[PDB]
Amino acid sequence: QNVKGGYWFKDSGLALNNIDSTLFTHLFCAFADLNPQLNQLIISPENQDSFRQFTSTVQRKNPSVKTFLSIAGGRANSTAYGIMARQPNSRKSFIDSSIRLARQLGFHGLDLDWQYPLSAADMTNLGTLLNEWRTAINTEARNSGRAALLLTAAVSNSPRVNGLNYPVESLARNLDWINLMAYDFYGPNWSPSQTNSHAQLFDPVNHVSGSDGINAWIQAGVPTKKLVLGIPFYGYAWRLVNANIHGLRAPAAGKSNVGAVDDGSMTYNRIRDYIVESRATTVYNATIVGDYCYSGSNWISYDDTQTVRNKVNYVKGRGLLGYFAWHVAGDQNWGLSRTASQTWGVSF
Numbered sequence: 001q002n003v004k005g006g007y008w009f010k011d012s013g014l015a016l017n018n019i020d021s022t023l024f025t026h027l028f029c030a031f032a033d034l035n036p037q038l039n040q041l042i043i044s045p046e047n048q049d050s051f052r053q054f055t056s057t058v059q060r061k062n063p064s065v066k067t068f069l070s071i072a073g074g075r076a077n078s079t080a081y082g083i084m085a086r087q088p089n090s091r092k093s094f095i096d097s098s099i100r101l102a103r104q105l106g107f108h109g110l111d112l113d114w115q116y117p118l119s120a121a122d123m124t125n126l127g128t129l130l131n132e133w134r135t136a137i138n139t140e141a142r143n144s145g146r147a148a149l150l151l152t153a154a155v156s157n158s159p160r161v162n163g164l165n166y167p168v169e170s171l172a173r174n175l176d177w178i179n180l181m182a183y184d185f186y187g188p189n190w191s192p193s194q195t196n197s198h199a200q201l202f203d204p205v206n207h208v209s210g211s212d213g214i215n216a217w218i219q220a221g222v223p224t225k226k227l228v229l230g231i232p233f234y235g236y237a238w239r240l241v242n243a244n245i246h247g248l249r250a251p252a253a254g255k256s257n258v259g260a261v262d263d264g265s266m267t268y269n270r271i272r273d274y275i276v277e278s279r280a281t282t283v284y285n286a287t288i289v290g291d292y293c294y295s296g297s298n299w300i301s302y303d304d305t306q307t308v309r310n311k312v313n314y315v316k317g318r319g320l321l322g323y324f325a326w327h328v329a330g331d332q333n334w335g336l337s338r339t340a341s342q343t344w345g346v347s348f
Contacts, residue, residue: 001025002347003177003228004340005324007070010050012329019328021062023337025347028111028324029054031073032101036080039090040097041071055106068109068152069102078122081114085125088132095129095136102149103140109150111179116161127167134174154179154230157213159220168220177321178222182210183232186301188255188264195240195250198301199232201289201311205249209288210311214320229315229323231340233268233330235302246294248285256298267330271302289314308336312343322347 007028008019021027029051035042043051055067072081084090098110110133117123133151141148155178159166171178185208186196203209210229217227237259241251255264258274266274271293275282280295284306291304303311312323323340331337 002344003322003324004344004347005179005228005322006328006337007324007326008328010047012327014329016050016054016057017060019058019061020334020337021058021065023334023341024062024065024328025322026066026068026109026324027054027058027328028068028070029107030070030327031076031113032069032071032098034072034076034080034084034094036077036083038097039084039093041094041101042097043101052105055108066108066150067106068111068150069098069105069107070111070113070154071098072115073113074115076113076115078114078116078118082118082122082125085117085122085129091129091132095133098133099136099140099149107149109152109176111152111154113154113179115154116156117164120164123164123167127170130167130170130174150176152177152179152228154181157182157185157208157210158216159222160216166220168217168222172222172226175226177226177228178217179228179324180210180213180217180230181326182213182230183326185209187236188238188252188259189262192238192252192254194252195238195246195292195299196248196301197285197288197290197292198236199290199303200285201307201314203288211314214315214318224319225321227315227320229311229320231308231311231323231325231336232303233325233327233336234265235268235271235300237264237266237298237300240294240297240299243294243297246281246299248288248292250299252299256300258298258300266300266302268302268304268336269330269332271300272332274300303336305336305339308339309343312340316344 183199237256238252239256278295280293
């Protein structure tokens with residue numbers, strides 16, 4: 001089966017019951033947390049009510065949709081995961097609790113979003129963790145007579161992150177697939193001084209792109225059929241230094257106040273509304289395969305219809321397993337989700 005994936009989190013402002021699960025094959029419920037005292041996977045009090053109903057609810061609209069419980073994510077404490085992965089006993093309690101929790105709540109899979117291991121030792125220990133996790137998943141399948149839980153991971157665009165190499169052999173051998181985070185290449189909180197496409201499929205300038213990421217993962221020895229390309233339903237707004245200079249790599253002064261206070265981020269839906277209200281000029285850049293818009297001193301990078309269509313055709317043509325969206329609530333009336341699904345077409 002090909003993957004048409006979508007991530008959801010409670011604080012996204014889309015009600016669980018309003019996720020259009022007909023546009024996806026796999027939905028990822030984000031995020032379960034690590035209890036550092038127990039070294040067990042848990043669900044926070046705030047997430048409890050929705051996470052327990054996640055699978056049954058989304059399956060009402062589409063009984064064939066499969067669900068993942070996603071783990072950790074961008075706001076998690078990476079040191080807690082490093083500690084957990086350090087020892088056989090803490091790995092075992094994490095592994096066992098994750099499998100129990102997935103089964104208890106009806107999830108068909110577990111998705112590790114550790115962002116990111118902090119040292120080479122942590123990367124090595126991640127490799128060991130996945131070895132043991134796979135064995136335990138296979139054993140539970142055998143013992144219960146049930147189909148094995150799926151195991152995936154959301155990973156950096158390239159297999160080298162923060163100067164550290166992923167345990168690529170372990171990822172390739174143990175995971176059903178990897179979710180490539182082909183976005184956040186640039187953003188006001190890490191690259192404030194110039195505009196850039198945060199998810200560009202191509203990059204002739206610096207080779208920071210989704211295609212270059214795919215290529216790096218392939219060169220590292222992960223098979224093409226285990227790659228799923230991430231697509232963002234959001235973007236970032238920069239403040240331009242000079243409103244007249246508004247292409248890629250235009251001088252900037254950090255986040256624009258049209259975006260979120262903390263990081264300048266905006267959902268695709270919010271960007272679409274902004275384009276209408278400000279009469280912003282929009283650009284599809286065919287070289288990079290990405291969109292941006294500008295109005296006055298405000299400049300926003302995002303993926304619109306043509307970019308989503310072209311990305312999906314590109315990865316389909318290349319023999320990747322599929323795509324996923326971060327995150328479903330960011331879409332405008334399921335526009336990009338439908339574009340992606342229908343562009344892919346038949347999902348097997």
